[PDB]
Symmetry: D2
Subunit: 175 residues, 4 copies
C-alpha cells in the first residue's frame, strides 16, 4: 500500500508475536517456580496476544490465504532463513568473537533448510494431485481413530469414525 | 555482549521466528478448513520448532531464564510501552490517512494491553507482599488439579485429596 | 432398550474411557522416564480411544444432545455420585479398616457436590436467560482477544476481534 | 486384594473415566452451541475427573509403574479388546440385526490389534536396548527443536537446543 499504516502493521505484527513467545516461556517458568495460577494467566495472556497479531496479519494479506499460497509463503520464508539471515548472522558473530553463538545460529540454519524441503514436498503433492493418491499402493492411517486402509488411493470417508478424506495420511512406523 | 551487532542480530532473529510461529499456527488452522489434517499437523509441528529456536535467542539476550519475580516486572513494562506509546502513535497515524476502522481496532487493542499491565502488577504485588497463598481475609481456595475446596486465610500446605502442593491452589471465584 | 447390544455399547463406552485414562497416565510416566516418542505414542492412542468411545456414545444418545440436555445429564450423574456411589463406597471402605482411602473418597465426594452446583448454575443461566444478560451493569471479558465491556448485556459482536457474543463471560479477577 | 474396596475402586475408576469422556464431548458441543465459557467449564471439570480416576488407578496399581510395566500392561489390554471383548460384541450385534454398527465394532477391532503390536514394538525396543541406538546408520530428529543427526546412536544431548536424548526419535517422512 506504500502507507505508514502498512509499516505500522508490520511493526505491530512483530512484538505481538514476540509477546506471545515471552509469555509462553514465562508460563513454564512460573509453573516450575510454584505458581500454577500465574502460569495460566501468562498463557491466557499469550493467547490474547496471539489473537491480536491475527488482526494485523489478516489486514496485511486481505484475509487468510489458502493452503497453496500459505505453503508458498512459508517455503520462501524458510529459504530466506538459511540462505540470508542465519548465514549473515553467523559471520557477524564470528567477526566479534562469538564462536559459540555462531555455531548455534548454524545448527538452527540447518533446521530451516529441512523446513523448506518439507514445505516444498507438501506443495508438490497438492499441485501434482498426489496429496491423497500414490502412484503405488500404500498404507493409509486415520488421524481420528487409527483405521488402516491399504490402497493406491485414500478413502473418501473413513469406514469407522465416518470422518472425511482429510484425516488420512501415509502411515509411518519409525520405531 | 551489549552494544554489538550480534545483539542487533540476536534481537532480530527473536522476531521473525516469533513471527513464523504465529503464521504456522494460522497456516495450520487454514489447513484443516482446506481439508489437509497432516499439513495442518506439520505446520503446527514447525511452529513449535520455531518456538524453541526463539527461546535460544531469548535466553542469550536475558542471560538464561529469569525468575518469575523479574518476569512479571518485564512483562508489566512491556505492556506499559504498548498502550502509552506504541499503539498510541499508530492510532493517530492511521486516522490521519483515512483508515478510521484500523485505528479503532488499534485503540481497542490498546485498552487490552492496559489491563494486561494492571493484571501483571497485581500478581507481582502478591509475591512481594506474600499474599499469593495467604490472605488476611478468610477466603475460599480451590485446587486446580482436582477441585478440592478449602476455606480459610491460608492455602493448604498439601491438597488432602490429590496430594498436590500449594502451587495448585488459587482464590476461587464463580463468574456467572 | 433391552438388547445385549445396548449393554455391549454401554460397556464398550466404559472400557474405551478407561483406556483413554490409562494411556494419558502412561504418556506422562514415559515422558518422565526419558521417552518422548513413546510418550507421544501413548497420547495419540488415548485420543483414538477417545474417538472410539465417541462412536458408542453417539449411538446410545441418538446423536449428540444440545448443551441444555447435556447440562441436565451432567448434573444428574453428578448428583448420583455424591449422594449414592461415593457415599456407599466410603462406608464400605471403613468396614474393612481402609480409613485412609475412605477419607479420599469423601474428599472426592465433596468435589462432585460442587460440580453439581456449577452445572445447575449454568443451566439456570440458560433457562432464565441470564447467560449474556444481567440485572446489574457488569464487566464482560472476551475470551478470544481480552476486550473488556461494561454494561448489563454482553456485546452482540466483539468490536476488537469481531467474534460473536459466545466468547464473552463475566470477568472474575481472582487474585 | 479380594476385598469389596478392590471392586469399588475399580468401579470408581470407571464412570470417573466415563465422565471425562462425556464432559469432553459436552465441551465440543457447547462451543458449537455458542457457549465458550460453558465449554471451558465442561473442559475444566473433565480435567478434574481425570485426576480423581488417577487416584483410584494408582491405588489399585500401587503407585505408578515403570514404562516397561506400562507397555506390558497396555499391550495385554488391547489384546483383550480384539481377541475377546469386541470379538464377542461383533457377533452379538449381528445375531440381533444391527449390521450397521456391527461393521464398526469389527473396524474398531482391527484398530486395537494395531495398537497391541505397536506397543510390543516399543517394548521390544526397550528390552533390546534399541530405542536410541541402532545397528544401522539411521537419521534421528530432535522432537523439541527439529535438529537432524545421522548416526548409529542418538546424540547424548542435542547440540542445538541442549535437550536430552529423550526428545530424539527415528525420522520417517511419510509424505
Ligand atoms: Fe497485543
Ligand atoms: Fe523458520
Ligand atoms: Fe477413522
Ligand atoms: Fe527457526
Ligand atoms: Fe501486550
Ligand atoms: Fe487437589
Ligand atoms: Fe478403542
Ligand atoms: Fe464426578
Ligand atoms: Fe474479542
Ligand atoms: Fe470425580
Ligand atoms: Fe483400546
Ligand atoms: Fe534439539
Ligand atoms: O503484545
Ligand atoms: O480402548
Ligand atoms: O466423578
Amino acid at each position: 500500500k506504500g502507507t505508514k499504516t502498512e509499516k505500522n502493521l508490520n511493526e505491530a505484527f512483530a512484538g505481538e508475536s514476540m509477546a506471545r513467545n515471552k509469555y509462553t516461556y514465562y508460563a513454564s517458568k512460573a509453573k516450575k517456580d510454584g505458581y500454577v495460577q500465574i502460569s495460566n494467566i501468562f498463557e491466557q495472556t499469550a493467547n490474547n496476544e496471539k489473537e491480536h497479531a491475527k488482526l494485523w496479519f489478516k489486514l496485511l494479506h486481505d484475509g487468510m490465504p489458502d493452503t497453496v499460497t500459505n505453503l508458498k509463503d512459508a517455503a520462501a520464508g524458510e529459504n530466506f532463513e538459511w540462505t540470508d539471515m542465519y548465514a549473515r548472522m553467523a559471520k557477524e558473530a564470528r567477526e566479534e568473537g562469538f564462536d559459540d553463538i555462531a555455531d548455534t545460529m548454524e545448527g538452527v540454519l540447518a533446521i530451516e533448510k529441512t523446513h523448506e524441503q518439507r514445505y516444498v514436498a507438501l506443495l508438490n503433492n497438492i499441485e501434482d494431485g498426489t496429496v491423497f493418491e500414490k502412484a503405488e499402493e500404500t498404507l493409509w492411517e486415520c488421524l481420528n481413530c487409527g483405521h488402516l486402509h491399504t490402497g493406491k488411493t485414500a478413502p473418501e470417508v473413513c469406514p469407522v469414525c465416518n470422518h472425511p478424506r482429510s484425516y488420512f495420511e501415509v502411515r509411518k512406523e519409525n520405531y
